[PDB]
Design an enzyme around this catalytic site. Structure first.
Site, PDB file in Angstrom:
ATOM      1  N   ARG A 227       0.842  -1.188   0.000  1.00  0.00           N
ATOM      2  CA  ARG A 227       0.000   0.000   0.000  1.00  0.00           C
ATOM      3  C   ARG A 227       0.880   1.242   0.000  1.00  0.00           C
ATOM      4  O   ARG A 227       1.976   1.246   0.567  1.00  0.00           O
ATOM      5  CB  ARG A 227      -0.949   0.014   1.211  1.00  0.00           C
ATOM      6  CG  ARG A 227      -2.037  -1.067   1.169  1.00  0.00           C
ATOM      7  CD  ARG A 227      -2.991  -0.762   0.047  1.00  0.00           C
ATOM      8  NE  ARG A 227      -4.142  -1.646  -0.014  1.00  0.00           N
ATOM      9  CZ  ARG A 227      -4.306  -2.593  -0.929  1.00  0.00           C
ATOM     10  NH1 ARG A 227      -3.367  -2.799  -1.847  1.00  0.00           N
ATOM     11  NH2 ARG A 227      -5.403  -3.348  -0.920  1.00  0.00           N
ATOM     12  N   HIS A 275      -0.590   0.556 -10.020  1.00  0.00           N
ATOM     13  CA  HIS A 275      -1.275  -0.370  -9.124  1.00  0.00           C
ATOM     14  C   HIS A 275      -1.862  -1.558  -9.897  1.00  0.00           C
ATOM     15  O   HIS A 275      -3.071  -1.736 -10.012  1.00  0.00           O
ATOM     16  CB  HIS A 275      -2.352   0.357  -8.311  1.00  0.00           C
ATOM     17  CG  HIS A 275      -2.832  -0.418  -7.118  1.00  0.00           C
ATOM     18  ND1 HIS A 275      -3.424   0.184  -6.026  1.00  0.00           N
ATOM     19  CD2 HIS A 275      -2.792  -1.744  -6.838  1.00  0.00           C
ATOM     20  CE1 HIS A 275      -3.739  -0.738  -5.135  1.00  0.00           C
ATOM     21  NE2 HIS A 275      -3.366  -1.917  -5.600  1.00  0.00           N
TER      22      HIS A 275
HETATM   23  N1  LIG Z   1      -1.938  -4.944  -6.691  1.00  0.00           N
HETATM   24  C1  LIG Z   1      -1.334  -4.875  -5.498  1.00  0.00           C
HETATM   25  O1  LIG Z   1      -0.440  -4.062  -5.327  1.00  0.00           O
HETATM   26  C2  LIG Z   1      -1.721  -5.787  -4.348  1.00  0.00           C
HETATM   27  C3  LIG Z   1      -2.459  -6.935  -4.570  1.00  0.00           C
HETATM   28  C4  LIG Z   1      -2.797  -7.758  -3.509  1.00  0.00           C
HETATM   29  C5  LIG Z   1      -2.390  -7.431  -2.238  1.00  0.00           C
HETATM   30  N2  LIG Z   1      -1.690  -6.312  -2.036  1.00  0.00           N
HETATM   31  C6  LIG Z   1      -1.283  -6.014  -0.666  1.00  0.00           C
HETATM   32  O2  LIG Z   1      -0.524  -7.116  -0.168  1.00  0.00           O
HETATM   33  C7  LIG Z   1      -0.839  -7.296   1.207  1.00  0.00           C
HETATM   34  C8  LIG Z   1      -0.453  -8.684   1.678  1.00  0.00           C
HETATM   35  O3  LIG Z   1      -1.498  -9.594   1.372  1.00  0.00           O
HETATM   36  P1  LIG Z   1      -1.374 -11.057   1.983  1.00  0.00           P
HETATM   37  O4  LIG Z   1      -2.479 -11.885   1.409  1.00  0.00           O
HETATM   38  O5  LIG Z   1       0.063 -11.512   1.864  1.00  0.00           O
HETATM   39  O6  LIG Z   1      -1.694 -10.653   3.524  1.00  0.00           O
HETATM   40  P2  LIG Z   1      -1.490 -11.603   4.827  1.00  0.00           P
HETATM   41  O7  LIG Z   1      -1.418 -13.067   4.429  1.00  0.00           O
HETATM   42  O8  LIG Z   1      -2.535 -11.127   5.782  1.00  0.00           O
HETATM   43  O9  LIG Z   1      -0.007 -11.226   5.333  1.00  0.00           O
HETATM   44  C9  LIG Z   1       0.274  -9.985   5.961  1.00  0.00           C
HETATM   45  C10 LIG Z   1       1.610 -10.075   6.702  1.00  0.00           C
HETATM   46  O10 LIG Z   1       1.945  -8.823   7.302  1.00  0.00           O
HETATM   47  C11 LIG Z   1       2.361  -9.067   8.652  1.00  0.00           C
HETATM   48  N3  LIG Z   1       2.034  -7.945   9.554  1.00  0.00           N
HETATM   49  C12 LIG Z   1       0.831  -7.362   9.738  1.00  0.00           C
HETATM   50  N4  LIG Z   1       0.937  -6.365  10.654  1.00  0.00           N
HETATM   51  C13 LIG Z   1       2.219  -6.331  11.073  1.00  0.00           C
HETATM   52  C14 LIG Z   1       3.014  -5.561  12.046  1.00  0.00           C
HETATM   53  N5  LIG Z   1       2.469  -4.573  12.783  1.00  0.00           N
HETATM   54  N6  LIG Z   1       4.320  -5.854  12.171  1.00  0.00           N
HETATM   55  C15 LIG Z   1       4.908  -6.831  11.461  1.00  0.00           C
HETATM   56  N7  LIG Z   1       4.248  -7.583  10.563  1.00  0.00           N
HETATM   57  C16 LIG Z   1       2.931  -7.380  10.345  1.00  0.00           C
HETATM   58  C17 LIG Z   1       1.645 -10.329   9.129  1.00  0.00           C
HETATM   59  O11 LIG Z   1       2.346 -11.028  10.170  1.00  0.00           O
HETATM   60  P3  LIG Z   1       1.781 -12.409  10.797  1.00  0.00           P
HETATM   61  O12 LIG Z   1       2.107 -13.505   9.789  1.00  0.00           O
HETATM   62  O13 LIG Z   1       2.530 -12.525  12.098  1.00  0.00           O
HETATM   63  O14 LIG Z   1       0.299 -12.182  10.980  1.00  0.00           O
HETATM   64  C18 LIG Z   1       1.595 -11.106   7.833  1.00  0.00           C
HETATM   65  O15 LIG Z   1       2.754 -11.936   7.752  1.00  0.00           O
HETATM   66  C19 LIG Z   1      -2.325  -6.964   1.292  1.00  0.00           C
HETATM   67  O16 LIG Z   1      -2.716  -6.557   2.609  1.00  0.00           O
HETATM   68  C20 LIG Z   1      -2.468  -5.845   0.281  1.00  0.00           C
HETATM   69  O17 LIG Z   1      -2.365  -4.591   0.945  1.00  0.00           O
HETATM   70  C21 LIG Z   1      -1.341  -5.499  -3.037  1.00  0.00           C
END
Ligand SMILES: NC(=O)c1ccc[n+]([C@@H]2O[C@H](COP(=O)([O-])OP(=O)(O)OC[C@H]3O[C@@H](n4cnc5c(N)ncnc54)[C@H](OP(=O)(O)O)[C@@H]3O)[C@@H](O)[C@H]2O)c1
Ligand SMILES: NC(=O)c1ccc[n+]([C@@H]2O[C@H](COP(=O)([O-])OP(=O)(O)OC[C@H]3O[C@@H](n4cnc5c(N)ncnc54)[C@H](OP(=O)(O)O)[C@@H]3O)[C@@H](O)[C@H]2O)c1
Ligand code: NA
Ligand code: NA
Ligand code: NA
Ligand code: NA
Ligand code: NA
Ligand code: NA
Lengths: 312, 312
Positions: A227, A275
Site C-alpha cells: 500500500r 497499481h
Molecule cells: N496490486 C497490489 O499491489 C496488491 C495486490 C494484492 C495485495 N496487495 C497487498 O498485499 C498485502 C499482503 O497480502 P497477503 O495476502 O500476503 O496478507 P497476509 O497473508 O494477511 O499477510 C500480511 C503479513 O503482514 C504481517 N504484519 C501485519 N501487521 C504487522 C506488524 N504490525 N508488524 C509486522 N508484521 C505485520 C503479518 O504477520 P503475521 O504472519 O505474524 O500475521 C503477515 O505476515 C495486502 O494486505 C495488500 O495490501 C497489493
C-alpha cells in the site's frame, strides 16, 4: 442459498453466471440500492453501508487480498457489519503467482544491473559492469503472509539469501525469520532488496520512512507492492538522492493515480506501475469462494478469515 | 602432467593457482611466446597459432561456451590443431543459470508489460493496461542445447507454452520439439517470444532476417543471447518499425562494441547489454576442467566435445 454480489468495476454478469455454475443451488443476484431481500452470503468490493447494514449474513467475502478499506469503512459505520458476521478475503486466487512474476523479474533485473545498462544505453555508451554476488544480495520481505511466502519461495529458487519480518515467528527453512518492532532494526540491516508485502494497518502506516531507510545497507532497492501509505514519499526521495537507495519500483502510492506533480514520475531511479502488481483471477476467486462456502457448510475449518480487532 | 594456460583478459594468476589446487599432480604454467616445452593439456581463449601448432596435446579446453572463433582460426591455419587433438568447451559452468536469470527476467518483464509502463511513465502518464495471457505467450528457443534446455526449464516453471528448434529431435516433456530447416517455419509461427541460443556456424549466420521475422506472430519479442551474426540488424530495425516486433533485447551484435552510429542504441523498443549475458564462473570452470581431465584419465565418457566438422 441466496448470494448478493457487488463490485464497482468488474464484469458483474460474468461473475454472477460463474457463481451460478459453481454453486448450482445458489440464487445469485447483483445488489442494487433498495434490495432488502434476504441473503446468506455477500460478495463485496467497496460496498455501500446500506448493502450490509443490519444483515445477519452467514459470511461476507471481500473480493480482494487487502481489506483496509472495508475495515476503515466499518470503523466509520460500526452498524455496517454485525459482529456475528464472519469476514473473508481472497487468499491468493492467482495473486501469489502474479506477485512472484513481479518480484522475480525486478529482483533479477536489479541483480543483473539492467537498470545501469539502461542508463548507459541512453548515452549510447558501451560498458560491461562488475557482476553482483548472491552473498551481497540478501532479500528481505516485509510481510510474511500468503503473498510474502509465495514471493520468498520463488526467490529461494534463485538461491538468494532470504529473510522475512512479521508479527509472529515463521518456520520457513532457509528464510531467517524476524518478528516484532524490537527485531526490525536487525532485519533491515542486511536487506539489499526490501520487498513490502505488509497490509495497511495503523501499526504499519508510514513504516518506510527516514528512520527505516537509514538502517538499510547502502545501494539498497525498494520494491513496494503493498500500500502507498506504507511509504513516506519525501523520505524515499531523499534516500534516492543521497545514494542510500539505488532504486525503487513502486506499484502503489499515497494518492492514486499518482499526481503528475510528484517527483517520483521523472526520477531517474524510480519505476512506476499503476497499481497492477496482482489482481485476482475471477475463475480462481470463484473456485475459492464456492470451496469456502462448501467447507463452511460442512463444518470444516477455513482460516482465510479477517481479524477485525487485529486489522487484517 | 603439464598444463599451459592462456587467456587475454582473465586473472591468469588466480586461474593457475586454482588449477594447481584442483589438480595437485599438474605443473601449471602461463603460456608466453617462445615456450615450446611439453604440455599435456592446453586451456585457451583466443590463442595464438604458435601456442597450439604442432603440439600432440591430449586435449584442449576452450575457456568459453562458444567456439566459433577458435574454429574459424583453425580454418585459416589448419596446422594450428592436429586432427588427433580433442577440443573441449565449457558446458554450463554457471552460464546456464546466468542465461536463466536473463531470460526469465526479460520474459516476465515483457509479459507484465513493464516496457509499456516505462513508456507511459516517461510522460508521467498513469494507465493500467490489459493483461496478457500464457496461451498467447508461447516462447520459442532457437538452440536446444546446454543453454537452451536450461532456459526452457526455467521458463516451464512459470507455465509458459514452450517450443524449441534444433537439428535433432528433443524429448523434453512439455516442450514441443522442432528439427531442421524444413520445420523452421512451423516453429516460428507461434513464437510470441523468440530466444536465440544458437552457435555461430555457416548454416546459422544471418538466420534472423526479414524472411524469418515475417513468419513470427505480430508483436513478437526477440531476445538475442547467442551471436550478433545471427541477426540482420537492418531487417530487425524494419520489423521493429512496422510493429511486427514489439521489442528486442540484444546482448550481442555484428560489431562489438556496438558502434554509436547504430540506430539500435536510441530505438525506443530496443534494450542493449554489452555482451554480458553469461560469462563463465572461474571456480565452476576449474571444477569442470579437472573433473573432465580425471574422466579422460579413467577412460570414462565425457561428451562435452566439439565436432570440428559440424562446426560446434
Ligand atoms: N496490486 C497490489 O499491489 C496488491 C495486490 C494484492 C495485495 N496487495 C497487498 O498485499 C498485502 C499482503 O497480502 P497477503 O495476502 O500476503 O496478507 P497476509 O497473508 O494477511 O499477510 C500480511 C503479513 O503482514 C504481517 N504484519 C501485519 N501487521 C504487522 C506488524 N504490525 N508488524 C509486522 N508484521 C505485520 C503479518 O504477520 P503475521 O504472519 O505474524 O500475521 C503477515 O505476515 C495486502 O494486505 C495488500 O495490501 C497489493
Ligand atoms: N554472453 C553470451 O552472450 C553468451 C554466453 C555463452 C554462450 N553464448 C552463445 O550461446 C550458444 C549456445 O551455447 P550452448 O552451450 O547452449 O551450445 P550447444 O549445447 O552446442 O547447443 C547449440 C544448439 O544449437 C543447435 N544448432 C546448431 N546448428 C544448428 C542448425 N543449423 N539448425 C538448427 N539448430 C542448430 C544444436 O542442435 P542439436 O542439439 O541438434 O545439436 C544445439 O541444440 C553458444 O554457441 C554461444 O554462441 C553466448
Ligand atoms: Na454490481
Ligand atoms: Na477492501
Ligand atoms: Na553468485
Ligand atoms: Na596468459
Ligand atoms: Na572461441
Ligand atoms: Na494466465
Amino acid at each position: 442459498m441466496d448470494i448478493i454480489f457487488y463490485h464497482p468495476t468488474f464484469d458483474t454478469q460474468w461473475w454472477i453466471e460463474a457463481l451460478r455454475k459453481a454453486i448450482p443451488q445458489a440464487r445469485v443476484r447483483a445488489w442494487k440500492s433498495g434490495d432488502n431481500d434476504s441473503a446468506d452470503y455477500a460478495l463485496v468490493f467497496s460496498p455501500p453501508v446500506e448493502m450490509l447494514a443490519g444483515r445477519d449474513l452467514k459470511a461476507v467475502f471481500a473480493l480482494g487480498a487487502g481489506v483496509d478499506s472495508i475495515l476503515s469503512k466499518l470503523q466509520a459505520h460500526p452498524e455496517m457489519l454485525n459482529p456475528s458476521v464472519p469476514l473473508f478475503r481472497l487468499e491468493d486466487t492467482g495473486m501469489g503467482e502474479q506477485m512472484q512474476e513481479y518480484a522475480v523479474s525486478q529482483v533479477l533485473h536489479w541483480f543483473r544491473r539492467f537498470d545501469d545498462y539502461r542508463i548507459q544505453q541512453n548515452s549510447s555508451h558501451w560498458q560491461p559492469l562488475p557482476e553482483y554476488h548472491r552473498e551481497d544480495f540478501t532479500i528481505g520481505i516485509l510481510g510474511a503472509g500468503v503473498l510474502g511466502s509465495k514471493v520468498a519461495q520463488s526467490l529461494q529458487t534463485w538461491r538468494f539469501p532470504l529473510r522475512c519480518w512479521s508479527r509472529t515467528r515463521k518456520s520457513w527453512p532457509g528464510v531467517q525469520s524476524f518478528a516484532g518492532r524490537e527485531e526490525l532494526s536487525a532485519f533491515l540491516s542486511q536487506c539489499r532488496v526490501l520487498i513490502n508485502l505488509l497490509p495497511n494497518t495503523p501499526e504499519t502506516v508510514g513504516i518506510i520512512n527516514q528512520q527505516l531507510l537509514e538502517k538499510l545497507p547502502d545501494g539498497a532497492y525498494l520494491l513496494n507492492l503493498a500500500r502507498g501509505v506504507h511509504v513516506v514519499e519525501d523520505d524515499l526521495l531523499a534516500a534516492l538522492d543521497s545514494g542510500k537507495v539505488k532504486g525503487a519500483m513502486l506499484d502503489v502510492f499515497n494518492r492514486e493515480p499518482l499526481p503528475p506533480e510528484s517527483p517520483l514520475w521523472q526520477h531517474p531511479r524510480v519505476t512506476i506501475t499503476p497499481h497492477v502488481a496482482a489482481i485476482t483471477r475471477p475463475a480462481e476467486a470463484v473456485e475459492y469462494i464456492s470451496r469456502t462456502i462448501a467447507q463452511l457448510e460442512k463444518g470444516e475449518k477455513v482460516c482465510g478469515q479477517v481479524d477485525r480487532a487485529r486489522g487484517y
